[PDB]
């Protein structure tokens, strides 16, 4: 998160606007990362928070997993269009509805 230069009392007004700290899968992931920013400061934090930033981004942005998912689907379709699969056995057995 940004650092206002001013930091007058007004920043208290809009500071808590958007966060992840309210019942989120990434609440703990961000607190560690952002804490590390507070410890090392902003500019130096960007060079010491390699793991924490990547983990937090892979927890919210989720690009790392969605971009696994397409590799599986595309590689399932590529096999079939090459004839390596068959129509009857295209997909695996679906999961049970009462799950996840």
């Amino acid at each position: 998160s940004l650092t206002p230069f001013l930091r007058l009392p007004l920043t208290d007004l809009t500071g808590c606007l958007i966060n992840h700290q309210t019942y989120d899968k990434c609440g703990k992931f961000e607190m560690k990362m952002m804490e590390c920013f507070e410890a090392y400061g902003l500019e130096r934090g960007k060079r010491e928070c390699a793991d924490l930033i990547s983990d937090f981004q892979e927890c919210v942005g989720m690009q790392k997993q969605l971009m696994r998912f397409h590799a599986m689907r595309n590689e399932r379709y590529k096999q079939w269009l090459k004839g390596e699969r068959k129509g009857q056995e295209f997909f695996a057995d679906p999961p049970r509805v009462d799950a996840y």
């Binding site: 560690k32 892979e58 790392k64 696994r68 599986m72 399932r76 679906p94 999961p95 509805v97 996840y100």
Partner: protein, 48 residues
């Protein structure tokens, strides 16, 4: 170079402790399933 559970060997969580199970995304949970099964759960609210 595909490794199961990672993007070509890159773990999708570096900081996490060992054997730290993480619930995958809904879509990833259905990565190997037809659209029918997917829609049977995600659209129960809307009813199609």
């Amino acid at each position: 170079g595909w490794e199961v559970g990672t993007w070509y060997g890159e773990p999708v969580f570096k900081t996490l402790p060992e054997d730290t199970l993480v619930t995958p995304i809904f879509k990833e949970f259905y990565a190997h399933s037809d659209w029918k099964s997917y829609a049977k759960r995600a659209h129960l609210k809307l009813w199609s």
